[PDB]
């Protein structure tokens, strides 16, 4: 079973070493394609880095809008979870109520 | 079975290698498209960034408050969502 | 199957690269459409900063009103979020009653 | 029975040994090709690493925010997953 | 049973020890085969080490993007998990909010 | 019953002594064979350590992470897996 | 007779130890792991026939509400 | 006489096995041969500690649970 199988495997492995350098080429083309897919991801990466790493203005607002896209997606989310209480600062009558978001005075944030 | 399959794979792979040179071209074009769409999102975002940087954290927090209504709107289409204060020593113990 | 598919895809790829430049145009248009969704968001942003970076007043008040609205739709929310003891002070008799209600003092807010 | 089995194994071993020498050569070609698919991925990764090192952490955090939406999208196609604070004395429990 | 079994074992073992030095050879070729499969992996590894060891730019973004890939997979996941909720940092009214994504300013990440 | 059995064990144990002589002649060879298959694994590994030392933790990390796609592909056939943050007072519990 | 023979069966398995023990004490759990994986195949065929196998956390003040 | 004999077996088995109950570990095994002969009729529900059976196989509790013996941890 494995004797003729291995001999034919050696011959087809000559053929497939030729076709495996050919795979170098073809999967190189699919490599550029997948590079380019994850590099549209990466151009999102660049764009957002240059835009919002100097100072996260919309990365602040995207902590926000993407915690809310996460929690516009928490519908699927059976997930038990825990945010923090001083996050939603449901501390309405508190000293640290607007320690949470008088951090709007930049420096606390 | 691997001989004919290997020959057809080599032929299809040459066709796909030329088609995939042109698909790397297509991928540059489709990335112009995807960059510019994800940047519909993200250029809306950068102009928001400029608004909040020049003006301050106004709607940083106020879409952290208006969209914080989204928390109470949308948390418990499931049944186990909650939170836990910080600056403290919480004994976190998730529900069952 | 993948051979005819590949060749037809290469010809369709030439015509679809032309249509892909057309797609670049169409996606600049979608660029504008989502630019503007989050730029109505951003009009809110620019003005809320100019009116609150001075001092987060509607942000104080909108932590309060977003806590109120978060409660308000916690009503329909099954969420086993909570609050806890002693800020909205319903230790209705307490110093903390004058440290959650007198927490409204500026400086404590 | 082990007699015939082991003699057959000897002949199979000869054919497989020569086979596998050339499978190692074909695998030099295929290691290049697999490095190349992993290059699709990893060279997207080189350009991402360069992009983020040059431009800070924008999408380090914004695939932690934008594609963190994936966390809510996916975490819960089962019913016992969660995400929960720290920076406290959190004394975690996990459910039945 | 064990007597004839042992005698046949010894004879079959003479020819099988010939066959098993021959297995040193055969398993050596399999050795190089497994070597080169996980070398596709390994030189992907060398290349990724030049990609990332210099600076964890995409190590950071891939902590996170593998988070999201692992997550697209955690669809099937039952695995009961945690965050530190200051990881997405959904801290939707908080100072620690803009400590999570003022880590955008390289150095805290 | 143990008289005939004892005599049989006597003779068969001497036969197994000689069979041991050549079973670990065979097992000089079989130690080598198993050594060498595990060496296929572990020399993929020697040069993997080489690749990730001459280059670094790139894919020491990313075949944690690209392979963490596999973490999630493989874990979930089970239904009680977890991963829970440090920097806390976790009293980690387990499900039922 | 097993003065000789047991001391010897040890000599065998024991110094199988001696050698792997140098392997580990020198550098660590390298084939412990790799043959965790040869194990995976065969041995964890056997140990996946076995039902429940959890893990444990690390780096925390860990505890456990063990199965009832 | 009886108590001296039995409790003196206890005496000196005690010194020998309290320099180490290592023979008592090999005796877990050997008295377990006898116990596999006899206790077959049983229902014991005996949970014990993690680090015997293999696959705690590279964290602290088992690096001192089985891998302890590396000179430096014992």
DSSP string, B51-75: HHHHH-SHHHHHTTTTTTHHHHHHG
State how far residue E3 is from chain A, nearest Cα, in angstroms.
31
Neighbours of chain E (3+ CB pairs under 8 A): A, B, D, F
Work out the burial of residue C75: count CB atoms within 10 Å of its CB; fewer than 13 is exposed, 13-18 middle, 19 or more buried: exposed
Closest CB to A67 among E61, E88, E105: E88
Chain G residues whose beta carbon lies within 8 Å of the beta carbon of residue D92: 60
Report the Cα H62 to chain-centroid distance in Å: 17
Report the Cα D35 to chain-centroid distance in Å: 13
The residues in E 89-108 lying below 8 A from F, measured between CB atoms, are: none
CB contact under 8 A, D91 and F91: yes
Q: Give yes or no for E78 touching B (CB within 8 A).
A: no
Q: Is A59 helix (H, G, I), strand (E, B) or coil?
A: helix
CB contact under 8 A, G61 and D91: yes
State how far residue A56 is from chain B, nearest Cα, in angstroms.
7
State how far residue B87 is from chain C, nearest Cα, in angstroms.
15
Among A85, A89, A94, smallest CA distance to C101 is for A94
Among B93, C78, F95, B82, smallest CA distance to D78 is for F95
DSSP F33-44: HHHHHHHHHHHH
Experimental method, per PDB record: cryo-EM
Tell me how long chain H is. Answer: 74
Q: Is A81 helix (H, G, I), strand (E, B) or coil?
A: strand
Taking each helix axis from N to C end, the angle separating E2-52 and F2-23, rounded to the nearest 10 degrees, works out to: 40
Closest CB to F89 among G31, G54, G61: G61
Resolution (A): 22.0
Rounded Cα–Cα distance for residues C91 and G22 (Å): 68
Rounded Cα–Cα distance for residues E76 and G45 (Å): 23
H-type helices in chain E, by residue range? Answer: 2-52, 57-74, 97-100
Rounded Cα–Cα distance for residues G4 and B70 (Å): 79
Q: Is C83 helix (H, G, I), strand (E, B) or coil?
A: coil
Please report the number of interchain residue pairs, chain A to chain E, with beta-carbon separation below 8 angstroms: 76
Chain E residues whose beta carbon lies within 8 Å of the beta carbon of residue A84: 85-86, 91, 94, 96
CB contact under 8 A, B49 and A52: yes
Report the Cα H1 to chain-centroid distance in Å: 30
CB count within 10 Å of CB F17 equals 10
Work out the burial of residue F3: count CB atoms within 10 Å of its CB; fewer than 13 is exposed, 13-18 middle, 19 or more buried: exposed
Q: Is D86 helix (H, G, I), strand (E, B) or coil?
A: coil
Rounded Cα–Cα distance for residues B64 and B71 (Å): 10
Rounded Cα–Cα distance for residues C35 and B45 (Å): 7
Which of H67, H68, H71, H73 would best serve as a mutation to test chain G binding (most G beta carbons within 10 A)? H67
Q: Are strands D82-83 and A80-81 parallel, antiparallel or unpaired?
A: parallel
Rounded Cα–Cα distance for residues A49 and A35 (Å): 19
Rounded Cα–Cα distance for residues D9 and E27 (Å): 12
Q: Is F21 helix (H, G, I), strand (E, B) or coil?
A: helix
Q: Are C67 and B61 in contact (CB under 8 A)?
A: no
Closest CB to D88 among B78, B80, B86: B86
Rounded Cα–Cα distance for residues A51 and E16 (Å): 69
Q: Are C43 and B59 in contact (CB under 8 A)?
A: no
Among D29, F30, F36, smallest CA distance to E31 is for F36
Q: Are A21 and D29 in contact (CB under 8 A)?
A: yes
Rounded Cα–Cα distance for residues G49 and G68 (Å): 22
Rounded Cα–Cα distance for residues B83 and A85 (Å): 6
Q: Are D37 and A27 in contact (CB under 8 A)?
A: yes
Q: Are E81 and D82 in contact (CB under 8 A)?
A: yes
User: Positive or negative CA dihedral for B62, B67, B73, B76?
Assistant: negative
Rounded Cα–Cα distance for residues D95 and D37 (Å): 40
CA distances from C70 to A12, A103, C82, F20 (A): 67, 20, 11, 78
Which of E92, E97, E99 would best serve as a mutation to test chain B binding (most B beta carbons within 10 A)? E92
CB count within 10 Å of CB B87 equals 16
The conformation of residue F80, written as its DSSP 8-state character, comes to -
Work out the burial of residue G59: count CB atoms within 10 Å of its CB; fewer than 13 is exposed, 13-18 middle, 19 or more buried: exposed
Rounded Cα–Cα distance for residues E48 and F59 (Å): 5
**Residue D31: HSE in the Cβ half-sphere, 13 Å Cα cutoff:** 25
């Amino acid at each position: 079973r494995e004797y003729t199988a291995a001999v034919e495997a050696k011959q087809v492995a000559q053929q497939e070493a030729q076709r495996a350098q050919f795979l170098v080429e073809k999967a190189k083309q699919e490599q550029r394609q997948k590079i380019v897919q994850a590099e549209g991801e990466a151009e999102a990466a660049k764009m957002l880095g240059e835009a919002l790493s100097k100072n996260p203005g919309y990365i602040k607002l995207r902590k926000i809008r993407a915690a809310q896209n996460i929690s516009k997606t928490i519908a699927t989310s059976q997930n038990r979870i825990y945010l923090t209480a001083d996050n939603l600062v449901l501390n309405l009558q508190d000293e640290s109520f607007t320690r949470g978001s008088d951090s709007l005075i930049k420096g606390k944030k | 079975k691997e001989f004919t399959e290997a020959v057809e794979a080599k032929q299809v792979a040459q066709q796909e290698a030329e088609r995939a040179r042109f698909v790397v071209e297509k991928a540059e074009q489709q990335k112009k498209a995807a960059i510019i769409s994800a940047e519909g999102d993200s250029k809306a975002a950068e102009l928001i960034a400029n608004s909040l940087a020049t003006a301050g954290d106004g709607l940083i927090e106020l879409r952290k408050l208006e969209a914080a209504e989204d928390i109470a709107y949308q948390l418990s289409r499931s049944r186990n969502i909650t939170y836990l204060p910080a600056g403290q020593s919480v004994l976190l113990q998730l529900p069952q």
